[PDB]
Symmetry: C2
Subunit: 360 residues, 2 copies
């Protein structure tokens, strides 16, 4: 099945995918490339491109007096391993397209541009380029402008359903150092004891719930230490993360995890923290969620289940905006080799945003 | 202080150290190199050089009808990191020498050769080249010859004291694989739970004792798994070892450690196992130890405390020979950058073996 709106979405998507916006290394410029392309594809919009530095670039486009803001990040995660073809050359099959970012989340950007060119309805777009890694600057800078909007729709793969809540996120780098002064002589033995305590604690939070979400997703993703089997390891690196439910005390959680290290870890660095959506006290979280639900209803968007993954909708929400996550595709394909999104999803999403923007 | 015997020991040691016998890679040949040197420095001895293959070479030399056998391994561990000068160029200060293998254990080989050239007393030497790594062949092959000896003295740094007992040794390679079928999804979480159980078990054996030796020395020396903090790690490698006391059930210990992995480890490989010294039931161990004590007394060697490190004396003992460990230097310098041994230690050891061999 094909429509003019979908065909245009596919043409724009092929172009967007061809632009290298991998982050790292986030080699994104304010001039030329993808932003030059978008500037040329937004008729009737007042456009502004802001270079926040080091690859963090924003394009804020406004046409008319829109009440809603669509935010879409243009950066993608790095490619491979295992891609069967050039990740930057969008491929197409009978029912889907394959390319780096087609699912997360250039497909949404392509659809919004198509809608922008299919009618002159009011619309506000905020394209950023630093969502996939550390050192983000785009959204924080935009929030500092205090621009009014009844709601902000942040694009991420949600199978074209409005998601009103999601977990927060934390990532930590730990370094254990042997204490030759001894049961703590080994940095690896220390890491083992720390890990056992951390996992036990996570288990004690298994009954916490929010919107179908249960427990604390916790993950020790990297451990690297020692050299030989019988040689005492003087050092060990451990990287872990967790995804709190809204209203959970993240500061307290982090301190709890740090305190499980006896002796103290030589290094304990939270490399990133993102709030849950919504965030704050349980009362605030529920009130904010209901507000987002009312916006989704007003926009005729089917409501989807709360998700475990993180999005910048959490930032807009903490900033005082009613916010929701909405985009084509499934998170299951995000960050995968031969990442894909079905034409059905693209079609559903573009028709929906075109309705919001250009519909009667 | 200098003596002719010590001077000769130092000359031979400089030569022995200059021969590259690092293991790995164990690039040791039966022809040329160090074995050609030893063949030329053993007057009056019937000499045989056996190539067991792949760098495992033995030189068995006998003069007269000796009742004791001196075994010295000629291979050394690899050099660096941090050596301040060429590891193969023996350096000398006022009270010591520095070079790869001067302490473990070429110093002993140099002293024995010096003694062999200082008199024509009966003596039997067995120089091997595969003690420092896996795939040993020399000693096993020698034991298969069933040659009678009242005792075998194996050289290792014992500060010139006769050591009659030491721990056994085991090294294991484990691989955990995530089970995407789930609390076991992460190979690192599995490794953490395994480690906690292993350490707890080790603690439960803290009261076992033998010759001043207490507990089970256990060590998780390497852990390598995962890629990113919040990405589920599908695999993880863990290398650990332990050093049992004589009479401990090593087979049972290994199975216990393997059983702590739930689910089962994807890979569990004991890469090396060496018996304790002596080995067998407690009654046998004590009887064998006393026999070694009587030999040390007969040879006028001061008795040293049992050690935690491993030696091939354990192999000779399990083979039916009364065996002991005896050599110059301290294990503290073994395998270290700028490895050294004092002239005092070399002097004490060479005078002792010269007495055993050439003394009235």
């Amino acid at each position: 099945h094909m429509t003019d709106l979908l065909a245009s979405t596919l043409e724009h998507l092929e172009t967007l995918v061809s632009f290298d916006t991998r982050n790292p290394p986030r080699a994104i410029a304010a001039e030329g490339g993808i932003f030059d392309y978008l500037r040329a594809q937004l008729p009737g919009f007042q456009v502004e491109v802001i270079d926040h530095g080091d690859g963090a670039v924003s394009l804020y486009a406004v046409r008319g007096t829109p009440k809603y803001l669509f935010n879409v990040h243009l950066d993608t995660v790095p490619d491979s391993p295992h891609w069967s073809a050039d990740p930057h050359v969008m491929r197409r099959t009978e029912d889907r397209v394959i390319g780096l970012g087609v699912c997360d989340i250039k497909g949404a950007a392509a659809a919004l541009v198509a809608a922008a060119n299919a009618g002159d309805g009011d619309a506000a777009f905020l394209f950023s380029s630093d969502e996939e890694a550390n050192d983000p600057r785009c959204i924080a800078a935009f929030l500092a402008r205090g621009l009014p909007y009844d709601a902000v729709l942040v694009a991420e793969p949600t199978m074209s359903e409005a998601v009103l809540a999601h977990r927060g996120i934390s990532s930590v780098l730990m370094r254990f150092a042997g204490r030759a002064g001894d049961p703590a002589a080994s940095a690896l033995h220390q890491a083992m004891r720390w890990g056992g305590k951390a996992l036990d604690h996570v288990e004690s939070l298994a009954h916490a719930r929010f919107g179908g979400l249960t427990g604390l997703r916790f993950n020790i993703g990297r451990v690297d230490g020692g050299i030989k089997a019988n040689m005492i390891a003087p050092a060990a690196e451990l990287r872990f993360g967790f995804r709190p439910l809204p209203s959970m005390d993240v500061d307290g959680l982090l301190a709890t995890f740090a305190g499980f290290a006896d002796p103290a870890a030589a290094h304990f660095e939270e490399t990133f923290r993102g709030p849950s959506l919504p965030s704050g006290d349980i009362a605030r979280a529920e009130e904010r969620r209901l507000a987002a639900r009312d916006v989704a209803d007003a926009l005729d968007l089917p409501i989807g289940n709360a998700v475990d993954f993180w999005t910048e909708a959490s930032l807009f929400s903490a900033g005082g905006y009613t916010a929701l996550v909405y985009g084509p595709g499934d998170i299951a394909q995000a960050h995968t080799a031969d990442e894909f999104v079905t034409l059905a999803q693209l079609q559903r999403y573009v028709e929906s945003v075109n309705r919001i923007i250009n519909g009667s």
